[PDB]
């Protein structure tokens, strides 16, 4: 007759009943929403992968190190990444100049 | 003649301090979609200290007057929660320096190994692709020395730093993992600024870099990085049985017998369809064949419960 085990179990059971329908909780553990959110998360990550490889070949990391000497160049590179993440063409980058 | 450039990096946004967990994204999206120039909604991870309340961020186009949008949404509740938003100003300091010891050879050589493992793990974890930046990556970790020439006759290293930057820029742009700070920004892709703050090497130490202090940095830094590759915790097979892991096929059998109700003698009415049967064996054949949509949902409910029950690092009250 363990009180601690019965308390942790009842707290867990009362938690599941309370947070059943909530979207944050469903997203973590419910098979359908975990499957849908992971595919959505993978698609967003695959978009970011193309942005990195675009910045590689275009040459935004060509002469750019992670040092505060080139703090201005990093901010410009970061803005160039967000433009490409939003589906921005090479014409759209010209406002950084 | 070509079109106007679009400043997509700049985007003004709102900030809601307290959002209840009963409110979904669709309710906040549908509320703000009626306003012109709506883009996306972000919600932080709910914290148990505040009864699982989230922090919201509604992003908009930079063309729109955010101050008037903030005023219109001021006294508007959703379900029962006052949203009461404020204007989120832009990020002031985006390139933050850290300690300057991180440009030393031995730390740079060590960070290439750690950064490579972060990429190796996260590329398998998220399941992209092999990654071309990790081709012959162990060839930079090994030392090259003129030891034979010294035996007979008896700081900054730019080549390694260029290699490290490609790994850290990959981690930060793709996986949203700020390496030098040792932290993920998981919601960034929904948040107002898609790639905000990045952390950068310091200027240079004014005094000599000590012999043991290099080893102490490496020990302390890997200690900070270890939670980033944390596989999700799970209870043991006995401990899950104590807490009450529901069996899928057994719980489905309970659903059948509960629905297989006996109205009278040679009368077995089930409430799912509402049709009479002569015996309980006929009702089981009816539920399995015809109502195959319901028995899937019972298995999903059990898995939904078991995934929550199995997770040792469980969301619970403080």
Author numbering:
A (entry chain A): 173 to 269
B (entry chain B): 409 to 537, 553 to 577, 599 to 762
Q: Paper's wording?
A:
ARS2 is a direct interaction partner of CBC and together they form a platform for the assembly of co-transcriptional complexes that determine the fate of diverse RNA Pol II transcripts. Our structural analysis shows that ARS2 is made up of two regions, residues 147–270 and 408–763 that co-fold into a structured core with an intervening glutamate-rich region of unknown function that is likely unstructured. The human ARS2 core has an unusual structure comprising a largely helical ‘body’ from which project N- and C-terminal ‘legs’.
Based on the incomplete model, the N-terminal helix was truncated at position 171 with the aim of producing better crystals. ARS2171–270+408–763 crystallised in hexagonal space groups P6522 or P65, diffracting to 3.2 and 3.5 Å resolution, respectively. Selenomethionine-labelled protein was used to solve the structure of the P6522 form using the single-isomorphous replacement methods with anomalous scattering. This required merging data from several crystals to obtain a sufficiently strong anomalous signal. A nearly complete model was built, making use of information from maps calculated in each different crystal form. In mammals, loop A (538-ASEPGT543PPLPTSLPS-552) is highly conserved and proline-rich. In most crystal forms, the loop is disordered presumably due to flexibility. In all crystal structures of hARS2 (except that with loop B deleted), only the first part of the loop is observed with 570-AEEEELL forming helix α10 (‘EEEE helix’). Remarkably, all crystal forms containing loop B, irrespective of space-group, exhibit the same intermolecular crystal contact, in which the acidic ‘EEEE helix’ and the preceding short β-strand pack into the positively charged cradle formed by the RRM β-sheet and the C-terminal extension of the RRM. To accommodate the same intermolecular contact in different crystal-packing environments, some angular flexibility of the loop B structure is required.
